[PDB]
Design a protein around this ligand. Sequence first.
Ligand SMILES: CCCCNC(=O)c1ccc(S(N)(=O)=O)cc1
Ligand SMILES: [Zn+2]
Length: 258
Amino acid sequence: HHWGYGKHNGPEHWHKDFPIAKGERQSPVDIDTHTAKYDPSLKPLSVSYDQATSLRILNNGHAFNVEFDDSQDKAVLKGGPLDGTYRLIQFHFHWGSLDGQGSEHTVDKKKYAAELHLVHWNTKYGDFGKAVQQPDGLAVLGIFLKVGSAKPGLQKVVDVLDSIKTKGKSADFTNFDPRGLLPESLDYWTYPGSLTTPPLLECVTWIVLKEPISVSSEQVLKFRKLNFNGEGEPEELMVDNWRPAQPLKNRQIKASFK
Ligand SMILES: CCCCNC(=O)c1ccc(S(N)(=O)=O)cc1
Ligand SMILES: [Zn+2]
C-alpha cells in the first residue's frame, strides 16, 4: 500500500508517483572504473565518528535504520568532495536474496551481496527536512559488503534483528560505534545523485568506498530473515531491497585514487 520492491510496486513503477525517477541525476549507477577520472584535487575524507550517539533501530518496511542523535555536530563527515559539515543521521543496508546481488551501486557491472549507506545532512540547512530539498543537502557514504569472514562490528546489529522482525518495530540501540563498519582504506569514487528510494530527491553527493567490508554468510542470512510486512500480515521476506543502476547521463564519476 505505497511503493516497495515487489513485481507490482517495485522500482519500474516508481516513476508514476515520483516522476523524478527518470530525472537527470538518479542513483544508483554503475561505476565504470575505466572511465572514472582520478582527481588529485580531491581532498581526503574526514570521517569523525568518535562522538557518535546511536539511539534506536527501526524496521521501516523497506530496510532497517540505525538512527543517531543529530541535534549537535557529534558524528560528522567533512572533506573529500564536500563543503562544510554533514551530520550522521542514520545508516541502513540494501541486500539480496542471494550472495551475487544486493548492492545498489555496481563496479564494472559487478554486484556485491549488500551495500551500507551512512546518511549525513549539510548543517548549513538547519534540519534534515530542509537539507533534502537542496542539491547539496545530503552526503551518503556507501560501502560494499562481500560474503567472507564475519565483521565483528556488525554483530551487534545482526543480534538485535530478531527484535525488529516486522514493519514498524523498533528497539533501543545505544552505544553502537559505526567506526566498526568502515574498511581500512577510505579511497572513494564520488558523483552527484539522488536518494535511491522514493521520493528519489536529487540531493545527494555520493561517496562510494573502493574497499568492501567482509561479512559472514551467517550475518547476511540474518538480514534475509527480516520481514517487509507488519506483524499479523502475510510473511514477505525482506530481500532484494535494491534499486538497479540508473543511467549516468551527463555526469562524471571522480576517483580519489589513481
Ligand atoms: C524525505 C526523505 C524520506 C525518505 N528518506 C530518506 O531519508 C533517504 C535517505 C537515504 C536514502 S539512500 N538509500 O539513497 O541512502 C534514501 C532515502
Ligand atoms: Zn540506501
